[model samples]
Target: SRPVFKQVLKVNSLQAQRVMERSFERVSNSLFSIDVILRIIGEQDEIDQVETVILEHISKVSEDLDKATAQLNKLMEDNGIDMMPGYTNPNEYTIEINSPQVAQFAHLIRKLDTLMGIVDTLWLNTVLTSKQRTDATYQWQQRLIKLAGRIIGIEKRARISAHSKGKEGEVAEAAPESATGDKEIADEAEKTK
Candidate 1:
């Protein structure tokens, strides 16, 4: 007996979604914590400028991810698969997604992990300069945007597998528009720098 690779991809997508949600939550909290550190250390002006910009990008990236999660949730529902949320294991996978598409998705997950580790250090170390904080914020923000876009693509592809191959609904009609809308958010955030 063999399982469709969609199941493999779906399982991994669930993990991806969980990781994204948790990471963003931590990043948001860490930024606030960083703000406090900056305030205490007398860099209030830098906090006012860079923190606001970073927060705006965080909000946008968050909104983007929330949409992607909902879309993926719907696709899974449409496929009759109940979502099991949270990152259990990356190595637990037997097989996974869209060739290079899957490759890119995995790569984004790796990038997020690496950035979060950097964030972990920065959030812990109060000695970071304003420039260091701002640079890290920018780098993390860019990766979040890319991760958001990748999830959107993953949902679209997965929906095709479920709706077209498995035979299903108009639920995906909104997918393309949301994907483009996500791109606009990424572009707008980019220009805010």
Candidate 2:
């Protein structure tokens, strides 16, 4: 049996379809929560190939989905004939994007992308496991193990985070046992196995 024929044989494999669909679900999932963040001082949309962003301002107190930006603002300026130190000042408002909040936020985005990227690689095993120098089916098993390791790691961390010391400390204490931060990462599990 040629390893090249593995793809041809996977057509009816429920196992492969299941694996493919699971990957689809994971990718379709939002990389992070919070669809909108505010102020947005300045956005570097797709900066360094990440964070797709658009910025806008709204002074309107009413509702209008089709509202448009001003077109003829030159006619009713301050009526002072473009005379002002504030509006024209180069330092009137430097972008207010950087702060502790921003750093925390950026991590959330990066963490999501990295996790998904690793998981996405698991999908390739559907083919890689078939008919290699060894058994083709073993490729899929290896992927399953890798994928499972990472997910279990994430799930454990989710539990650890859920137990943070706050008013919720009691619930946190009840989590079977405490999990260490470094120990709960998926990459660790994958490399270990």
Candidate 3:
């Protein structure tokens, strides 16, 4: 006879929830740290060491998340599960997504978007502020702005290049007589020998 099992295995739903919560917390913490580091680095100060350290940490965190996502996908595939609809794993496994996971992911995406906006504003403000602060900065900013304007003009022209195309090449056909009012004035000036 086969050996009889003594006890039934129990599912630890609480433990699983805790683990997912911790993972979410870790990602959120990393994003917050990155935001703070960006703000601090923007201030005028010696930030070489800080920047180096922060960049390393940010890269490491990103790699860690990639690995975690890969593992999650693998596990879901092994179980033949499906997450969110319209999403599938590399192995073509369908994984069902929990509500909390969706909420957390959405929150993280929104936070990233907000952070990106903040960074853009800070960058533009820094450029304009520095430009107004010094002659060198002003010259550099002017050059950059001029180049940007020219690029935008080119893009606009390309968009309209096919429709109203060669009309711009036409020169005005009308020509006016000499505004000097006298052929003698023009001829005398021309014959200065």
Candidate 4:
């Protein structure tokens, strides 16, 4: 389940990282308003300005960004990242949790990795905050931060509950048939936080 959490967080987080690095590209067309450049350059000569100068520079800039993106993407892919640009989200990733044998705990697995989306980018881009101050992404990020704190609190309760009930996954070492094992039960639970 933590792996699933990691996956969804990666999806949102990578979207964040890529966006921080390339949001200009994601949201805009050209680095310097290529239309204006073309207009002025067209007055000079398309051969001398547009094709000769702008295209090469644009290609190189594009290539460099692509190279950097590919490197970062490779890290994300190998490190369990599973998001796609303008195309996919955390809510849709995952099939099974590794430690869901006990049906009681299986429910938590379904709640993480919730919807992370681009479906509202244009709406977010257009909509104003209630105070007329910001976009939905800004508001959603603030909400996400608050949600994280609440989630952590819930995690504490869940961890306490798990320890109190004392269940163990199959791969967890059995302590020689001892009645309650040799250690505190939560000691065996993942400290992924």
Candidate 5:
């Protein structure tokens, strides 16, 4: 039977720490728009600007994700948790819910979630006929929604695991307070009002 929630473990060794960090990269990689979307949006001269805009948006989102990952790694270093980024996010791995790490990881996920929305909004708000918009972006949006949902599911498990371990206050709202402000700027950048 598939469990509705995932389990967690306290950070213990280099391997444990590496998995936690690499998961961020996996989350980042999941946001990329599919090549089919690119072809559809780019083949038409009228929508060619949209293709460039979307590529730039993806680039900016990756930049932000890398920065957030670096920030988390800094916190880990301060706490003496030796970690190095790995190329893989193993499915069988521990999600951390210990102390301050939990909140920071939640914030990073929140950031990723926000970036996902920014991508959605960018596609939806592009200047195109409703039919064209639907045809060009629908598959990409479907893919992104599924990826975002799974990542968010992981975020919930980590937070709930924190509560079970008697760290409810540390996990707090998981709101990504500053993330809201960043999204406002991103929304404006894409001119979505």
Candidate 6:
């Protein structure tokens, strides 16, 4: 059961990760184009004349980044793999809280964190490292840092939960709760938290 849960979580995380990567690439390409435009404008004799062109390009890049961030956030929200409050039983429909599921969720959160880091590095390289970094680049850098931090925090929490679930799985394998009649799940859960 836990393996099945992990599989489902991985599938969702991979899908979300792909979307996020594409959005990042789009934003990077837009920013690169803006940089090229800025360079072209800079070649002009009059610096004042080029300022307007630079501003226009910068604005476009900013807008693109904003839209990309929004899309990525939406994906993250839909994936349920970020720093959200643990759902344990979100649907309360038929999903059971099992060790495999918990492990998979933890793995998903970790993957999300890794993805966030990759995006952050890409943002830094594309925008932050540009010759004439704009205010928008700085803003985006800050936002990426914040997003990565949030994912890291969530991953930590999920790790704790996963560890507890693993211990429960171990005890269960040793002897079914019915055999040993041990009701230590609550204690184990509390220790994990």
- Per-residue CA lDDT of candidate 5, range 54-115, in tens? 44444554565667456544544455554332223333344433323233443444454443
Local distance difference test, candidate 4: 0.30
- Better candidate by lDDT, 4 or 5: 5
Error of model 6, residue 140, in angstroms:
12
Off by over 4 Å in 2: 1-11, 17-134, 167-193
Q: 2 or 3, which is superior by TM-score?
A: 2
Provide C-alpha RMSD values for all models, in order. Answer: 21.5, 25.0, 29.5, 26.8, 21.4, 25.0
- Clashes (candidate 2): 4
Best by lDDT: 1
What TM-score, over all chains together, does every model reach? 0.30, 0.24, 0.23, 0.24, 0.26, 0.22
Better of 4 and 6 by TM-score: 4
lDDT of 3 at 157: 31
The residue-by-residue lDDT of candidate 3 on 34-122, one tens digit each, is 33333333433423543344344334434544554465445445655543221121111122223332233323333332322232333
lDDT minimum window of 10 residues, candidate 1: 170-179
Top model by TM-score, which number? 1
Better of 1 and 4 by TM-score: 1
The regions of model 1 sitting more than 4 angstroms off are 1-96, 143-193
lDDT of 6 by residue, 55-134 (tens): 44344534555566566556554544344322222211122223332333233334444444434433444422343333
Which digits, one per residue and each the tens of the lDDT, describe model 4 over residues 1-193? 2432222223343333332222212111221223323333234554244334433433443354345346544545455555533534432333232321111112212211122232133223433234432343343333322322222233333334334445323112321111212122223213324
Clashes of 1: 0
Cα lDDT over the full model 6: 0.35
**Whole-model Cα lDDT of every candidate shown, in order:** 0.41, 0.27, 0.31, 0.30, 0.38, 0.35
What's model 3's overall lDDT? 0.31
